Design a protein around this ligand. Sequence first.
Ligand SMILES: C[C@](O)(CBr)CCOP(=O)(O)OP(=O)(O)O
Ligand SMILES: C[C@](O)(CBr)CCOP(=O)(O)OP(=O)(O)O
Ligand SMILES: [Mg+2]
Ligand SMILES: [Mg+2]
Ligand SMILES: [Mn+2]
Ligand SMILES: [Mn+2]
Lengths: 176, 180
Amino acid sequence: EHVILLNAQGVPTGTLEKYAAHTADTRLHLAFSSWLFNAKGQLLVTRRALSKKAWPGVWTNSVAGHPQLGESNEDAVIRRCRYELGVEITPPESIYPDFRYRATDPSGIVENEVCPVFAARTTSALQINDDEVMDYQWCDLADVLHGIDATPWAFSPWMVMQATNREARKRLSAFT
Amino acid sequence: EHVILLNAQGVPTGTLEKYAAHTADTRLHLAFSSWLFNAKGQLLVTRRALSKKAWPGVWTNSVAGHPQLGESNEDAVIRRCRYELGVEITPPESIYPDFRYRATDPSGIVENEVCPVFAARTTSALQINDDEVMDYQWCDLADVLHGIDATPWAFSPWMVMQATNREARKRLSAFTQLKL
Ligand SMILES: C[C@](O)(CBr)CCOP(=O)(O)OP(=O)(O)O
Ligand SMILES: C[C@](O)(CBr)CCOP(=O)(O)OP(=O)(O)O
Ligand SMILES: [Mg+2]
Ligand SMILES: [Mg+2]
Ligand SMILES: [Mn+2]
Ligand SMILES: [Mn+2]
């Protein structure tokens, strides 16, 4: 399992083992983020497990990850949905294709990514992988956005940045 | 360190080593919770360290702890402010003397407490203790309360419970005034 290093432009130039790649000096690599909603339109919010190298124990959107070499973004979502949440989904739809961001977590671990964002509906029940998720909540998107707007610090900076992009919010909202 | 055990009614009966007292079977003991505001009236919110036995990595109010034998509640507040946050404060005011709290954390660890709540002003700069606090923010109380109502599940349950108590909340509000 690896991450894909990107040069100044989004061109892959090689790979790194996933664990070894997230450091205090993380280099730009390829990733995804997705927001999941159930049949009713509830958003799934998850809390990262305390064993995650980056942002452990942090509340964030439904699922995020690292596409492997030759893997489509959409396949990557599907894979991590199965792996982290044991859940089936509908074809992921683009919500924020040009999201790119760098941030530092409270222990100094950095994420540095070209991270296209997706949305999908779940088609099965969750089956939680507690190596990845320690808690989660099904909730109204409206409420989630309010909490992000009032106390953004309570959420992953990654979730906050995506939810505050005007178009991404529209599309998440239109997603219901 | 230890905790002070309380019987079926809130009366002390002795002490228990602190680690050993916090389990899936935690017996009632004494605790405190305090909400701190800077001169500007902003509230300090903190994120519990990942190594805390109970609610690790969770966003919560300013400071909480366990009074020791011979120690007043208000002295315990002073001490943990100093220990956890490196910070000097004004005399703690009692804002919810009757708060009681029993709850299980994400891993099964139980807290079961008589936990009077306080408010105070910080009088010095912070010196965060990373063994106790992994993150923090200075915030407007209004914003914190709005976030708590919108996504209460993202915060420690004690913080939500205290902030939703009517009389306590009025006291937090009073501490948002700017003071010189
Ligand atoms: C964390 C992010 O920077 C927010 Br987009 C994306 C990476 O996902 P990740 O959860 O870190 O990856 P993984 O699921 O494999 O742990
Ligand atoms: C969390 C509480 O149930 C507040 Br209701 C009391 C425990 O605080 P604590 O910070 O965990 O205690 P300590 O600082 O002494 O370790
Ligand atoms: Mg992931
Ligand atoms: Mg404490
Ligand atoms: Mn990464
Ligand atoms: Mn306790």
